[PDB]
Amino acid sequence: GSSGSSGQMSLEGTEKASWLGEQPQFWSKTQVLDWISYQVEKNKYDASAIDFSRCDMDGATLCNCALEELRLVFGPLGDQLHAQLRDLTSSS
Numbered sequence: 052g053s054s055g056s057s058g059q060m061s062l063e064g065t066e067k068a069s070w071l072g073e074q075p076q077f078w079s080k081t082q083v084l085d086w087i088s089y090q091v092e093k094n095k096y097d098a099s100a101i102d103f104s105r106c107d108m109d110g111a112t113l114c115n116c117a118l119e120e121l122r123l124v125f126g127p128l129g130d131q132l133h134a135q136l137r138d139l140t141s142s143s
Contacts, residue, residue, distance in 0.1 A: 075139045078110025087125065090132055100126035114140050 068089070070082040078086075084106055091098045105124045108116060114136065121136075122129030 074142075075114045075136055076111050078113060080107070080109045083108050083110060083113055087132070090135060091128065094128060094131055096128050101128060102126075 068085070070078055070086045073082075084103055087101070087103075087106065088098075090096075091101070102124060116124075118129070118133050120129075121133050125132055
């Protein structure tokens with residue numbers, strides 16, 4: 052907007068990620084929703100469409116879920132989330 056106008060609210064947090072270090076297949080009901088916020092805050096998504104109530108996937112269900120599915124549970128944001136999950140499982 053003008054002279055910053057961003058980054059003036061909650062700028063502290065350094066305790067690793069609850070979903071960092073473990074594959075997407077061994078994720079918990081919390082880790083999942085926890086990973087979403089990360090992609091929702093990075094993609095600048097309003098996050099006023101996704102249905103967290105529908106995201107009951109613990110972990111194995113997320114990696115097993117389908118593309119169109121993630122798009123119906125996380126709105127149009129799924130298209131972006133899937134791309135990420137596709138790399139997590141892919142591994143090196």
